[PDB]
Ligand binder design. Sequence first.
Ligand code: HEM
Ligand code: HEM
Ligand SMILES: COc1ccc2c(O)c(C)c(-c3cncc(-c4ccc(OC(F)(F)F)cc4)c3)nc2c1
Lengths: 319, 58, 98, 370, 72
Amino acid sequence: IEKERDVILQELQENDTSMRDVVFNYLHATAFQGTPLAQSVEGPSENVRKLSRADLTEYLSRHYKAPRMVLAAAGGLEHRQLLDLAQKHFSGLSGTYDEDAVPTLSPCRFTGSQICHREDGLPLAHVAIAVEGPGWAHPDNVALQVANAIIGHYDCTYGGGAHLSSPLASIAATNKLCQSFQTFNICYADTGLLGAHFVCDHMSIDDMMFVLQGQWMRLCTSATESEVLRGKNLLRNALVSHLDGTTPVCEDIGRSLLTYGRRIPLAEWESRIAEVDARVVREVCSKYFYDQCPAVAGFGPIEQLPDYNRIRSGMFWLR
Amino acid sequence: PTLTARLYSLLFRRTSTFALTIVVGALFFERAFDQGADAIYEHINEGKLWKHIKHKYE
Amino acid sequence: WLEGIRKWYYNAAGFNKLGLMRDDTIHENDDVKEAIRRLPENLYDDRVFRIKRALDLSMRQQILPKEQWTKYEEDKSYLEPYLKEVIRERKEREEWAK
Amino acid sequence: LMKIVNNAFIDLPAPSNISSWWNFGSLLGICLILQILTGLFLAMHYTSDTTTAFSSVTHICRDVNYGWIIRYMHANGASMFFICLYMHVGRGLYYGSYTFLETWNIGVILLLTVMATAFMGYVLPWGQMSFWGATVITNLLSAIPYIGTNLVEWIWGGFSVDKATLTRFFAFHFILPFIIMAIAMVHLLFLHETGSNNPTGISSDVDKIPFHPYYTIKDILGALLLILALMLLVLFAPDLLGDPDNYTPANPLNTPPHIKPEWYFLFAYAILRSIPNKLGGVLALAFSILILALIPLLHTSKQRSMMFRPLSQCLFWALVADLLTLTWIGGQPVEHPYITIGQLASVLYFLLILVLMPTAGTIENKLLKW
Amino acid sequence: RQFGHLTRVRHVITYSLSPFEQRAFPHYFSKGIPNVLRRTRACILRVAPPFVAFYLVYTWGTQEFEKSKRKN
Ligand code: HEM
Ligand code: HEM
Ligand SMILES: COc1ccc2c(O)c(C)c(-c3cncc(-c4ccc(OC(F)(F)F)cc4)c3)nc2c1
């Protein structure tokens, strides 16, 4: 307990350099203020120093209960083989608990805010903007994964350059507005984050947040079936390609049984994809992008970063 | 929900719809304000204006 | 006594009420920027915060509690050692021309 | 690709703390543009001849559809246009913005360019105080040796104020504002190389902010309040700052009792009436204005603002009282109590600026061990 | 000039909210008022006295001006 205490304090010093992880941790701090979700997985260095064996036995004796847990597998085995071992071993778990031992999760308060950690010494500028998400089980998650996929993602190593389809990626490779960006949709129990991450030189931020927000508002107002169809075909391949190997499959089993309660087969995902068209995307993005109060984060020479009222000003059009 | 939220969902969301409210508001505002304003002025200056006495000289 | 008078004037000015030191206030000038450029990062990065905090106060037209105000005896002259050096260099450049 | 120039109105770096005192720079941009539109619509019905000018104002104020409001949005649109300056200047002196020499020396050149334009503009209605105002005030140049008898007759286009004196003012008047508009864009140009000052006098590169949502709406507010105090006078006290003798047409053979310019010159006039020697009075008059160009050469404190200069604060607000005095003395007649006061105040104006206020910052440096 | 390279800043953090998520008039009377009086007393003794002095010379000069015009 005391050895790993020293190790984890050494890890935080390393994660102080992983600028990417910092931003999301700053991001959740601001979107989800005053709630647990603002916390990090690792927590502050103080609690790492001020911890006890007793604190853990409390944590383990409380949360690790069979009903909240899942065993799952994949590969060259059989279901029936798994049961004979579960009863052999996992029959001994505490399948019960006191009248109010297991907590429940209430919704968490999203809020619109900004955090701007200025550090000019560092050569590049990580940025992350997002909004409130639906949650896991909400069905419009499907449509959004398309919408992000229309925007796609980019690094300076992709050889397509200007000829890419995502007009954001096309512009970025042309004018060298950035080195990298992407599109994420983190899904929590009844909410989530939806937005994007990007890296760029300190003299190039204002150009990105003017094109990025343009594409969002472009979709909220007018998107074509061709590019939606382009996005759909990406979402198909990602699910298929993500499910290649016994490891990511049983991941998909495990969390889906915790998030959704069941697993969804790719046939049903495709069925949900099939109900998408341009009309769906315009509406859903208009619910969750158009004229909302986002969360913003910055780390590095973010001097050029538009102030939140300009960010918020660009979350709508006069059209 | 409240009225303010209903107003936003229908009117202040689309900037096209938004603007038409403002013109529509101006018309009924232009009418309502002028009537109310004149009534106060006349009520203060009752019996001093031309029309208040004009009836005597027709 | 003059020391007591210097002290009263300091509190009368009020840049202690915004947590600033003396040298934070000096007129931006060629001889000064040279001196600022020569500051170390620790002392410099402190100067920037003492300023940016103060501006955030005057925007709100507020001040800090008495516990955080700058004390007269604690008024550090962190910039004069470097500034008096620069002005000496300037007079040599002038004297050398003459 | 004009609108890279609109970055001076949208994406411009500006500090965060600046209070209302800086709005008065923008408001001139409103008064000026406001005043040009009004005075233009007065040109449509004005006549520059002496037999027709005074009536021409009546044509406006009587027969025209809402001609009358325009006269008073425009006359008093000059009065408010000088409340804005004198506070726009006092900022520049109290908060120490005069270190932007290139702007300040142009700030002077805007002031003179204006404060002669109102003089010309006050003639055009062609009443007593209009005429007699111009009769007295042009003769002061006659005090100069070897020139004045020639220059004054030249400006008059004759040997006394008459037709051709009027008609040329109307042309010197209805042009310079278009020259003033140029110098403003110039005046800003040297400001947008340096960025504005703050109450502290400290470099604000760290806590800058954009200009589009923040000061814009602040200027919309400050502009709105300006339109109040203008229209109140137009709609509740239009003859207030005026002078009723103006509403008698010009009679060069009947001198009014009280000759004086309008309120916004009077502190200058009191300085003149103070000195008995005529020519020596003049060089004091012009120097009461041009002294602004001597301020930066009399800067002594190693600080800039006066929020952090107690003694200069007390002297500054004393200067304001000396001005307000001179505004009052000039409006009042010349007798033994007011003569004595007008002398003392005028001496304070030059003394306080040249001697005490520099002397203060020297002392203030000494207390700070400088 | 423009944003981006105006100066150099390091290890400084800013937090801010969305205006749609906070009141525009928080403690407007509750806290704002004593700040004014605090903002007032901090400066008033430096603004008042010359204008206080003005009001006196205004009246005294006015009365003495009147008395001069009356008679022996
Ligand atoms: C820019 C600085 C200006 C100043 C300080 C100024 C000041 C004045 C003042 C005080 C008057 C007296 C009006 C009265 O007593 O009724 C006047 C008259 C006049 N002004 Fe302005 N003015 C300015 C610009 C303009 C402009 C831009 C125009 C036209 C575009 C204009 C047109 C006139 C006219 C035609 C008159 C004579 C008509 C009348 O007074 O009824 N002036 N000016
Ligand atoms: C037509 C007349 C004028 C126009 C259109 C004008 C316009 C402006 C504007 C819009 C600003 C920016 C706002 C501000 O900094 O307050 C400004 C700044 C300034 N003005 Fe003028 N102004 C005029 C008259 C004057 C005069 C008469 C003076 C001095 C006698 C003056 C001195 C200054 C200075 C020093 C600044 C910059 C001060 C600072 O940024 O800290 N201005 N002017
Ligand atoms: C931070 O301080 C500054 C710094 C620089 C400035 C600058 O370069 C300019 C050009 C101006 C300005 C000059 N004239 C007019 C306006 C104006 C503003 C609102 C209006 O809108 C309406 F509401 F109608 F008045 C109409 C006109 C602004 N103000 C500056 C203020």
